[PDB]
Design a protein around this motif. Structure first.
Motif, PDB file in Angstrom:
ATOM      1  N   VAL A  89       0.851  -1.188   0.000  1.00 59.72           N
ATOM      2  CA  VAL A  89       0.000   0.000   0.000  1.00 59.72           C
ATOM      3  C   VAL A  89       0.891   1.244   0.000  1.00 59.72           C
ATOM      4  O   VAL A  89       1.751   1.384   0.866  1.00 59.72           O
ATOM      5  CB  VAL A  89      -0.941   0.021   1.226  1.00 59.72           C
ATOM      6  N   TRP A  90       0.684   2.149  -0.964  1.00 61.85           N
ATOM      7  CA  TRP A  90       1.174   3.523  -0.841  1.00 61.85           C
ATOM      8  C   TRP A  90       0.072   4.492  -1.255  1.00 61.85           C
ATOM      9  O   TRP A  90      -0.247   4.602  -2.448  1.00 61.85           O
ATOM     10  CB  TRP A  90       2.441   3.784  -1.658  1.00 61.85           C
ATOM     11  N   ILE A  91      -0.483   5.215  -0.280  1.00 65.96           N
ATOM     12  CA  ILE A  91      -1.587   6.141  -0.504  1.00 65.96           C
ATOM     13  C   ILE A  91      -1.230   7.527   0.015  1.00 65.96           C
ATOM     14  O   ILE A  91      -0.399   7.701   0.924  1.00 65.96           O
ATOM     15  CB  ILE A  91      -2.893   5.660   0.162  1.00 65.96           C
ATOM     16  N   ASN A 113      -0.780  14.075   1.294  1.00 62.75           N
ATOM     17  CA  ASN A 113       0.514  14.293   1.938  1.00 62.75           C
ATOM     18  C   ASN A 113       0.969  15.737   1.772  1.00 62.75           C
ATOM     19  O   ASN A 113       1.458  16.356   2.726  1.00 62.75           O
ATOM     20  CB  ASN A 113       1.550  13.314   1.377  1.00 62.75           C
ATOM     21  N   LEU A 132      -2.055   8.126   7.070  1.00 61.08           N
ATOM     22  CA  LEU A 132      -2.004   7.183   5.960  1.00 61.08           C
ATOM     23  C   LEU A 132      -1.718   5.765   6.444  1.00 61.08           C
ATOM     24  O   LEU A 132      -2.148   4.802   5.802  1.00 61.08           O
ATOM     25  CB  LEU A 132      -0.950   7.621   4.936  1.00 61.08           C
ATOM     26  N   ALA A 133      -0.990   5.624   7.561  1.00 58.21           N
ATOM     27  CA  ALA A 133      -0.789   4.311   8.168  1.00 58.21           C
ATOM     28  C   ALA A 133      -2.118   3.696   8.595  1.00 58.21           C
ATOM     29  O   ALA A 133      -2.371   2.509   8.348  1.00 58.21           O
ATOM     30  CB  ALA A 133       0.150   4.416   9.374  1.00 58.21           C
ATOM     31  N   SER A 163      -4.121   2.755   5.607  1.00 65.02           N
ATOM     32  CA  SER A 163      -3.505   1.534   5.098  1.00 65.02           C
ATOM     33  C   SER A 163      -3.815   0.316   5.979  1.00 65.02           C
ATOM     34  O   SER A 163      -3.954  -0.798   5.459  1.00 65.02           O
ATOM     35  CB  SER A 163      -1.994   1.752   4.982  1.00 65.02           C
ATOM     36  N   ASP A 164      -3.898   0.494   7.306  1.00 64.09           N
ATOM     37  CA  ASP A 164      -4.365  -0.589   8.183  1.00 64.09           C
ATOM     38  C   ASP A 164      -5.752  -1.095   7.765  1.00 64.09           C
ATOM     39  O   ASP A 164      -6.020  -2.305   7.756  1.00 64.09           O
ATOM     40  CB  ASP A 164      -4.474  -0.093   9.626  1.00 64.09           C
ATOM     41  N   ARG A 193      -5.531  -2.861   4.207  1.00 61.65           N
ATOM     42  CA  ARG A 193      -4.779  -4.104   4.053  1.00 61.65           C
ATOM     43  C   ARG A 193      -5.601  -5.318   4.478  1.00 61.65           C
ATOM     44  O   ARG A 193      -5.466  -6.397   3.881  1.00 61.65           O
ATOM     45  CB  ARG A 193      -3.470  -4.062   4.859  1.00 61.65           C
ATOM     46  N   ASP A 239       4.222  -4.030   4.472  1.00 60.03           N
ATOM     47  CA  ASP A 239       4.640  -2.633   4.445  1.00 60.03           C
ATOM     48  C   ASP A 239       5.795  -2.439   3.464  1.00 60.03           C
ATOM     49  O   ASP A 239       6.640  -3.322   3.284  1.00 60.03           O
ATOM     50  CB  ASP A 239       5.081  -2.172   5.845  1.00 60.03           C
ATOM     51  N   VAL A 240       5.860  -1.248   2.858  1.00 59.42           N
ATOM     52  CA  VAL A 240       6.884  -0.993   1.849  1.00 59.42           C
ATOM     53  C   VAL A 240       8.298  -0.921   2.417  1.00 59.42           C
ATOM     54  O   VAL A 240       9.257  -0.921   1.630  1.00 59.42           O
ATOM     55  CB  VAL A 240       6.580   0.299   1.058  1.00 59.42           C
ATOM     56  N   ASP A 241       8.471  -0.902   3.745  1.00 60.07           N
ATOM     57  CA  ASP A 241       9.810  -0.913   4.335  1.00 60.07           C
ATOM     58  C   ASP A 241      10.265  -2.302   4.753  1.00 60.07           C
ATOM     59  O   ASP A 241      11.266  -2.429   5.467  1.00 60.07           O
ATOM     60  CB  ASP A 241       9.903   0.037   5.533  1.00 60.07           C
ATOM     61  N   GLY A 284      -4.477  -1.396  14.278  1.00 59.47           N
ATOM     62  CA  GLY A 284      -3.240  -2.127  14.216  1.00 59.47           C
ATOM     63  C   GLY A 284      -3.255  -3.396  15.044  1.00 59.47           C
ATOM     64  O   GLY A 284      -4.286  -4.069  15.189  1.00 59.47           O
ATOM     65  N   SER A 293       9.467   5.999  11.612  1.00 64.47           N
ATOM     66  CA  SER A 293       8.021   5.827  11.450  1.00 64.47           C
ATOM     67  C   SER A 293       7.426   6.979  10.637  1.00 64.47           C
ATOM     68  O   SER A 293       7.801   8.141  10.809  1.00 64.47           O
ATOM     69  CB  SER A 293       7.316   5.724  12.808  1.00 64.47           C
ATOM     70  N   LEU A 294       6.483   6.651   9.753  1.00 62.72           N
ATOM     71  CA  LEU A 294       5.832   7.636   8.896  1.00 62.72           C
ATOM     72  C   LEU A 294       4.589   8.271   9.516  1.00 62.72           C
ATOM     73  O   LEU A 294       4.081   9.249   8.958  1.00 62.72           O
ATOM     74  CB  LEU A 294       5.424   6.991   7.559  1.00 62.72           C
ATOM     75  N   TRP A 295       4.061   7.732  10.627  1.00 61.12           N
ATOM     76  CA  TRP A 295       2.834   8.249  11.219  1.00 61.12           C
ATOM     77  C   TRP A 295       2.990   8.701  12.666  1.00 61.12           C
ATOM     78  O   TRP A 295       2.013   9.187  13.256  1.00 61.12           O
ATOM     79  CB  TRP A 295       1.714   7.192  11.153  1.00 61.12           C
TER      80      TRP A 295
END
Ligand code: U2F
Ligand code: MN
Length: 542
Positions: free
Chosen positions: A100-102, A138, A264-265, A268-269, A272, A285-287, A469, A517-519
């Motif tokens: 997921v990338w949104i 974003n 966005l996390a 994405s939760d 997914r 996750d993309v990482d 999560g 972390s992105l969020w």
């Protein structure tokens, strides 16, 4: 196996007392369970749930019954039978990798990670979910938060070196401004949708950014086109054609997170688990990176002075330093090793010629129709990796957990927000409602819901974990093992979760990307950000 009807009659035998009608119900249902050779795994689980529910009815009816010791033991046997049902009847997992990338354009770093999975799993279909309506979230969040940073420091022009205008106060004062700007946009968004229900998200956002923040639609439109092109070139999959997701009860929660919270996390939760329920496969996750061949570094002992996590990071840093599969990959930890250890990595990696003896492949995977398997780290289970057959029983339990958790949240949050009050009064009203509903069964969950308005904007705010999560996954497993739905207090021990855990050999989680972390962000990151913002503001680097 699990005890048959007369085996249980021996267990729950009363020397001189009549067969109550709640007891025969258990006996009949048990007998039916052992005559289910033509039934599916899920049907067998639902029958065990019927048996458990009838046993609870008996126990609750005759509270000091002599049978109750045997029947309580019988309930333990039922849980064992569920685990054995899960482990002994496996079916093939669909060969899909779901990423997921949104919210904005996908980064070259995510693509580079995704491509490693591609390179070693050629037999897997790969989806990179994106939202063609929502490429600008974003940019919107960055524009508002940067304006808030500047408004905050402006407010404090002269105490920039006052040791008391510390990083905690800065984020407290910034949070107030972010909330007013965030409410301003949400109000504009609800107005445009009421006047026009067929505007797309990016339409509303680029008009807002044009009016309020002086950006110009021409540039934002080119960004959108560039982002659509990139994701199409990289296995892109449009959420807006993911029909069942879009029409489902969860789509409103996805859009609450995407549009109103800019999380966005969390969005994405929510997405997914529907990809897993509706399609089946493995979510990543993309990482995350493929797992490392288990034999690769077997000859290299871990130094006593090094943590297991440190060691895991240096294993990936060594692969990248010598094979350069991914550009600009850090060597920060590998470089701290003794020269002799560093040399041991070099000669192992020099002995290998193809990526396939570095990263392993997923191959033919199988799982129970009952389960969703989940990754784990030293802290606990973590939904950065997930495996499930399509429509697994747990995927539905998890969808329900998330929906119930959002219902509890929005029951308290929406009335608080509907009163047009500022950040502090809204926070106080919200928390007061949450506390009035808090009990022994939900305390820690409610404790974390109370921070919801700050997610993404204040250090150490981790509410998403409890909402969409891992805790929702834990609760779903407890639901499964307790023959119920709606668990809110987690009493599973780590042993219990191990039955649902993904093998460490299938994902490398200690990646560079996984470290930022992105969020959410912690206090050290908060403090470094604060003192960089100050010098950016001083230098007029707005
Ligand atoms: O701009 C953006 C920013 C992020 N995302 C999505 O959010 C996902 C998670 O980002 P990230 O790795 O930074 O979260 P993490 O810190 O590990 O948080 C955990 O907890 C999270 C909350 O439960 C959970 O989502 C996550 O899996 C855990 F590991 C990322 O892989 C993208 O799918 C996005 O689509 N667009
Ligand atoms: Mn991560």
């Amino acid at each position: 196996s699990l005890v048959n009807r007369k085996q249980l009659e021996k267990m729950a035998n009363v020397r001189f007392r009549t067969q109550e009608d709640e007891y025969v119900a258990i006996l009949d249902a048990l007998e039916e369970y052992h005559n289910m050779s033509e039934n599916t795994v899920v049907e067998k689980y639902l029958k065990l749930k019927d048996i458990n529910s009838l046993t609870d009815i008996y126990i609750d009816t005759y509270k000091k019954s002599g049978r109750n010791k045997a029947l309580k033991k019988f309930k333990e046997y039922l849980v064992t039978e569920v685990l054995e049902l899960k482990n002994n009847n496996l079916t093939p997992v669909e060969k899909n990798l779901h990423f997921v990338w949104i919210g904005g354009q996908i980064n070259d770093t995510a693509i580079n990670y995704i491509n490693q999975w591609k390179d070693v799993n050629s037999d897997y279909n790969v989806n990179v979910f994106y939202d063609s309506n929502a490429f600008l979230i974003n940019t919107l969040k960055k524009t508002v938060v940067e304006s808030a940073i500047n408004d905050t420091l402006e407010s404090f022009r002269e105490n920039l070196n006052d040791p008391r205008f510390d990083y905690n106060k800065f984020f407290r004062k910034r949070m107030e401004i972010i909330y007013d700007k965030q409410k301003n946009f949400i109000n504009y968004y609800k107005a445009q949708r009421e006047e026009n229900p067929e505007l797309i998200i990016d339409d509303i956002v680029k008009t807002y950014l044009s009016n309020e923040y002086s950006k110009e639609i021409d540039e934002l439109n080119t960004y959108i086109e560039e982002s659509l092109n990139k994701i199409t070139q990289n296995s892109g999959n449009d959420v807006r054609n993911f029909e069942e997701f879009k029409n489902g009860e969860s789509f409103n929660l996805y859009e609450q997170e995407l549009v109103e919270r800019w999380n966005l996390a969390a969005a994405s939760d929510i997405l997914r688990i529907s990809a897993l329920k509706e399609i089946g496969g493995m979510y990543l996750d993309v990482d995350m990176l493929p797992g490392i061949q288990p034999d690769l570094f077997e000859s290299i002992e871990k130094p006593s002075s090094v943590t297991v996590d440190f060691w895991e990071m240096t294993k990936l840093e060594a692969i990248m330093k010598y094979k350069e599969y991914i550009p600009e990959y850090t060597s920060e930890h590998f470089d701290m090793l003794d020269e002799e250890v560093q040399s041991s990595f070099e000669s192992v990696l020099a002995s290998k010629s193809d990526k396939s003896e570095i990263f392993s492949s997923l191959g033919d995977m199988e799982a129970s129709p009952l389960e969703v398997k989940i990754a784990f780290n030293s802290k606990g289970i973590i939904n950065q990796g997930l495996i499930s057959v399509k429509d697994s029983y747990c995927s539905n339990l998890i969808v329900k957990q998330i929906e119930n958790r959002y219902k509890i949240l929005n029951n308290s949050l929406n009335p608080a927000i509907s009163e047009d009050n500022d950040f502090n009064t809204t926070t106080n009203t919200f928390i007061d409602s949450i506390m009035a509903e808090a009990n022994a069964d939900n305390g820690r969950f409610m404790m974390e819901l109370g921070k919801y308005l700050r997610v993404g904007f204040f250090p150490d705010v981790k509410t998403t974990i409890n909402l969409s999560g891992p805790e929702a996954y834990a609760a779903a497993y407890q639901d499964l093992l307790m023959f119920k739905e709606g668990s809110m207090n987690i009493h599973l021990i780590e042993a219990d979760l191990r039955n649902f855990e993904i093998s460490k050999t299938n994902i490398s989680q200690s990646t560079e990307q996984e470290m930022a972390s992105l969020w959410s962000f912690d206090d050290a990151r908060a403090k470094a950000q604060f003192e960089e913002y100050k010098r950016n503001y001083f230098e007029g680097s707005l």
